[PDB]
Design a protein around this ligand. Sequence first.
Ligand SMILES: [Cl-]
Ligand SMILES: [Cl-]
Ligand SMILES: [Cl-]
Ligand SMILES: [Cl-]
Ligand code: NA
Ligand code: NA
Lengths: 250, 250
Amino acid sequence: NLYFQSMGLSRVRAVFFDLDNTLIDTAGASRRGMLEVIKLLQSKYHYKEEAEIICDKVQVKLSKECFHPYNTCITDLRTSHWEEAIQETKGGAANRKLAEECYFLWKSTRLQHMTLAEDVKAMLTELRKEVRLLLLTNGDRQTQREKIEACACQSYFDAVVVGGEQREEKPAPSIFYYCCNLLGVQPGDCVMVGDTLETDIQGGLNAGLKATVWINKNGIVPLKSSPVPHYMVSSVLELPALLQSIDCKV
Amino acid sequence: NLYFQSMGLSRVRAVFFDLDNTLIDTAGASRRGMLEVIKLLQSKYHYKEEAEIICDKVQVKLSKECFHPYNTCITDLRTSHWEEAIQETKGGAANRKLAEECYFLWKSTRLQHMTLAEDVKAMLTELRKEVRLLLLTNGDRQTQREKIEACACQSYFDAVVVGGEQREEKPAPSIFYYCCNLLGVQPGDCVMVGDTLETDIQGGLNAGLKATVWINKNGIVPLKSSPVPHYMVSSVLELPALLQSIDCKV
Ligand SMILES: [Cl-]
Ligand SMILES: [Cl-]
Ligand SMILES: [Cl-]
Ligand SMILES: [Cl-]
Ligand code: NA
Ligand code: NA
């Protein structure tokens, strides 16, 4: 500390966290959503295995989703995913009401199941005593804000930034610099923590953050040409210990 | 771990520790030694303040000490330091017996007071479950081995290496490579921990060790042109936590 100052060398001042599958189980929650739609489609409307086909089709449509706010809102686009999947699978006339019934069961279920764990809450409270905390999350305004509210997590952060609201999102560095200015700190004083190499980690690298930490809960190996983070941990609960160590590097 | 292997990237395999004022309080113990010599010289022989002058003179002689094993052994050289300091201060005939009486009171006191703390013992036991441990200490054979025995610490290590026994000492890299071979590991797999930038840390740097950790208990600032370590901590008790973090760097 005395030494570090002498060297022109900063303690960490802010930590940016990812949201989806870093602090909340979006995959798990979303899967729960699909499970309920299947349960609905089968028990209520007497669909057999083709109920799974519809859900698959929706996952596929979600993953190539192309959202134009000028043209539609997100609820309509997503309800259409379901509407198409249903017709694609069961044929007949477009059935919007059934589409809505699915979309909303899916949405409500997954939001019900997006939660900060008690131990994650406990941590985020500790860290904030010592550093600033900012949530930096990709995605459209409505969907992400709904998520932030569903897991009641905004109170844990000094700021919250949603990519769909900004001119570029992760891994464009502009969004990181925007974050730094919100907090009044420098990129060199900041650590990005998140679960996706091509957004969270690469973004961190693009913006020259002090450090990038990759959460790899399942110990997967990534592809050869992919961005290399500064550290890798299995759990966000390890961050406090790691940050202490980071503050010792010279 | 799965990822790190994929990258060709090693967990730490061995940690080398410094001895003097890293695991035992050599300065404190040695000061205790001088205090007893003063107590002796004053109460027994009725010396006044000049007892402190003698001890100062010995510290000075120790710090510029020039040991030729071909010519003398260490006990004789050091007894001469005292003998000279006494004559320099109180004049008269060289008095070897008084010189010996001092040297041995000093030596016995400081050895009495070189001890591993219970918490340091507890740590070294934990680390060894997970990594190899080697003591790498500068100084003449007899003096250092006497110290190693005095604090009963050899049982905590897989190997113990004394610079005075080797062809070069810290920070010559030859001694580090020698250490690696003793343990059957690579320099890239090893971390040096110690309290002196110009021996422990520089040596680590010269030998390409994975990492060098500087213990700076008192938070002193070093001189501009001095070697920069990889980390700095206030206590060896922090090493376990730090090593975990080191094993996450990519
Ligand atoms: Cl993700
Ligand atoms: Cl399509
Ligand atoms: Cl020293
Ligand atoms: Cl002299
Ligand atoms: Na994510
Ligand atoms: Na030392």
